[PDB]
Design an enzyme around this catalytic site. Structure first.
Site, PDB file in Angstrom:
ATOM      1  N   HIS A  57      23.093  76.387 116.140  1.00 11.10           N
ATOM      2  CA  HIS A  57      23.815  77.550 116.697  1.00 11.10           C
ATOM      3  C   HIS A  57      24.650  78.275 115.658  1.00 11.10           C
ATOM      4  CE1 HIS A  57      23.661  76.067 121.182  1.00 11.10           C
ATOM      5  NE2 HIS A  57      22.475  76.437 120.699  1.00 11.10           N
ATOM      6  N   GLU A  59      27.681  79.412 115.630  1.00  8.69           N
ATOM      7  CA  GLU A  59      29.023  78.842 115.365  1.00  8.69           C
ATOM      8  C   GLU A  59      29.027  77.708 114.374  1.00  8.69           C
ATOM      9  OE1 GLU A  59      27.404  79.497 118.360  1.00  8.69           O
ATOM     10  OE2 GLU A  59      28.814  79.043 119.966  1.00  8.69           O
ATOM     11  N   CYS A  88      29.229  76.791 123.197  1.00  7.83           N
ATOM     12  CA  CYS A  88      28.780  75.673 124.047  1.00  7.83           C
ATOM     13  C   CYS A  88      29.582  74.447 123.717  1.00  7.83           C
ATOM     14  CB  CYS A  88      27.278  75.360 123.827  1.00  7.83           C
ATOM     15  SG  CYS A  88      26.890  74.426 122.309  1.00  7.83           S
ATOM     16  N   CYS A  93      29.118  72.791 119.508  1.00  6.36           N
ATOM     17  CA  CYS A  93      29.902  73.838 118.890  1.00  6.36           C
ATOM     18  C   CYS A  93      31.424  73.689 119.192  1.00  6.36           C
ATOM     19  CB  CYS A  93      29.415  75.232 119.363  1.00  6.36           C
ATOM     20  SG  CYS A  93      27.716  75.535 118.740  1.00  6.36           S
TER      21      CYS A  93
END
Ligand SMILES: Nc1ccn([C@H]2C[C@H](O)[C@@H](COP(=O)(O)O)O2)c(=O)n1
Ligand SMILES: [Cl-]
Ligand SMILES: [Zn+2]
EC number: 3.5.4.38
Length: 183
Positions: A57, A59, A88, A93
């Site tokens: 992801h 992030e 999430c 994250c």
């Protein structure tokens, strides 16, 4: 110099209509300010954008690149994320961001999200965990979308054009997020 986002990629990914399906990617536009006794210093070398890559992801990919920003540990920084999906919990994250903020108390984080990532069963715990680690989390409004267009997009001097319902969707999402984060 800093590479600018395609304008259709922006519009497609930051759209906040709740019925549009766009889970597959996340775009995260970031900037860092150094705070020099009340004075903000915001340099283009610390600005950019990232998406998800190789299943990771955006992030987490921002956290991967923090060492390259070369932040001085003797200085105070505020990082801002304009991110197309809120963070999430279940793919790591929120917990990695919390660990980052706990380890780097000289860094503060503001997260402005276009939409809430509720595909995660633990999405509310993610948002609450970020709040409690000191992140300021909010939903993007017209002002933020316009700033991002103006700052991160290859717009060739052309003005931001708000899509239909932008304000209505943003206020609705903001109500939902503020209820999750109520203290
Ligand atoms: N105001 C809301 C609250 C939840 N939801 C969705 C998000 C999830 O897919 C599902 C379950 O959410 P929750 O576990 O928060 O009740 O409902 C929504 O679309 N609008
Ligand atoms: Cl909000
Ligand atoms: Zn995630």
């Amino acid at each position: 110099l800093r590479y600018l986002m395609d304008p259709d990629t922006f519009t497609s990914n930051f759209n906040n209509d709740p019925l549009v399906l766009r889970r597959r990617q996340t775009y995260l536009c970031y900037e860092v300010e150094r705070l020099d006794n009340g004075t903000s210093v915001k340099m283009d070398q610390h600005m950019g954008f990232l998406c998800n890559e190789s299943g990771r992801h955006a992030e987490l990919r921002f956290l991967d690149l923090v060492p390259s920003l070369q932040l001085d540990p003797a200085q105070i920084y505020r990082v801002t994320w304009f991110i197309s999906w809120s963070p999430c919990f279940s793919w790591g994250c929120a917990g990695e961001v919390r660990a980052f903020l706990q380890e780097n108390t000289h860094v503060r984080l503001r997260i402005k999200a276009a939409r809430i990532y509720d595909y995660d069963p633990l999405y509310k715990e993610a948002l609450q965990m970020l709040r409690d680690a000191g992140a300021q989390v909010s939903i993007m409004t017209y002002d933020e979308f316009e700033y991002c267009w103006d700052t991160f997009v290859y717009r060739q001097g052309c003005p931001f054009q708000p899509w239909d319902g932008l304000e209505e969707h943003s206020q609705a999402l903001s109500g939902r997020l503020r209820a999750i984060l109520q203290l």
